[PDB]
């Protein structure tokens, strides 16, 4: 029984999202890649470096936005850019969110020497694909 | 704040190598000939021997960045075949898809 | 052939590279100087990225109140529990 990313059928109660409810064998088929960068094309360089950064960024986002990420992020790059699309819950006040966002942009930019400009997606509840 | 002591050691070794690399290279150049005297070569060898270990480039072992494991480590991504797999499955590496073949 | 040899020499002279004739052994040095050494490559010395920086910064953020290592929090809680207990 292979059991990597595939969330497990316990009952008919578990609410699961579309990215979360699809096994790794669907990645190209019924799913897409979350991160997007040139490194993994061939021949091309600096993949390893990128991967670490990617790993960091998601974690950072989670830390910052606690109970305010509905689903996993989408990291994008265009030359010297680092765009992020976060699906966020309408839980906290907008002012707070605004405060957070700018800070994140600045801090990340100073870290990676790359102008970040993340764009949020306010959705009241987690967008259920299956009640697994 | 590295994963374990082994990792730290490796890092240290790398640093040492970086520090003393040029000199090492020079000494190797001096050594590896049929050109020029034998005594000189011997001296060079001696010097090399004297120079501290860990500055040696061969002691540099590859591990995964995330989990400090020496084997199953792809040099393209510098991560272990467990960590890498984990990354891949969720879809956090662009390009990496399962080989339906 | 002598003429051929001469031509080769001329070519070598033109294209910078080793002019005087020599062995496969002495070319090693040349190769070395052409290359970077293995220790000076950006793959090698910067194989593991910072790590310390990553940890420390995160810790600082947590202290401030702009980030939350949930795992760290859990650990802290566990420690507290232990203290309460036995220990």
């Amino acid at each position: 029984k292979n059991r990597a990313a595939r969330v497990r059928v316990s009952k008919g109660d578990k609410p699961v999202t579309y990215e979360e409810a699809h096994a790794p064998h669907y990645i190209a088929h019924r799913k897409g890649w979350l991160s997007l960068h040139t490194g993994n094309l061939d021949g091309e360089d600096h993949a390893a470096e990128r991967t670490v950064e990617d790993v960091f960024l998601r974690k950072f986002m989670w830390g910052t936005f606690p109970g305010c990420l509905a689903d996993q992020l989408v990291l994008k790059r265009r030359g010297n850019q680092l765009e992020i699309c976060a699906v966020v819950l309408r839980q906290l006040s907008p002012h707070k969110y605004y405060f957070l966002v700018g800070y994140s942009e600045t801090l990340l930019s100073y870290f990676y020497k790359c102008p970040v400009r993340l764009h949020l997606q306010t959705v009241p509840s987690k967008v259920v694909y299956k009640y697994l | 704040h590295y994963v374990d002591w082994r990792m730290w050691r490796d890092v240290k070794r790398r640093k040492m190598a970086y520090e003393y690399a040029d000199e090492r290279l020079r000494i190797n150049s001096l050594r590896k000939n049929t050109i020029l005297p034998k005594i000189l070569q011997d001296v060079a060898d001696e010097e090399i021997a004297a120079l501290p270990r860990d500055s040696c480039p061969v002691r540099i072992r590859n591990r995964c960045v995330m989990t400090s494991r020496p084997r199953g480590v792809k040099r393209r991504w510098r991560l272990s075949r467990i960590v890498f797999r984990h990354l891949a499955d969720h879809g956090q590496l662009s390009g990496i898809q399962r080989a339906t073949w | 052939s002598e003429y051929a040899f001469r031509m080769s020499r001329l070519s070598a002279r033109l294209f910078g590279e080793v002019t005087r004739p020599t062995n496969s052994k002495s070319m090693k040095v040349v190769k070395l100087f052409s290359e970077l050494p293995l220790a000076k490559k950006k793959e090698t010395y910067d194989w593991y990225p910072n790590h310390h920086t990553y940890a420390e910064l995160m810790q600082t953020l947590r202290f401030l109140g702009l980030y939350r290592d949930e795992h760290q929090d859990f650990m802290d809680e566990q420690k507290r529990l232990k203290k309460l207990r036995g220990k």
Binding site: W62 | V3, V65 | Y54, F74
Partner: peptide
């Protein structure tokens, strides 16, 4: 390290051990 850490849910699951 920081990369050796992970999300809370997993940790909780590990702690609980409600799946033999």
């Amino acid at each position: 390290s920081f990369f050796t850490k992970l999300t809370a849910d997993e940790l909780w699951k590990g702690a609980l051990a409600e799946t033999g």
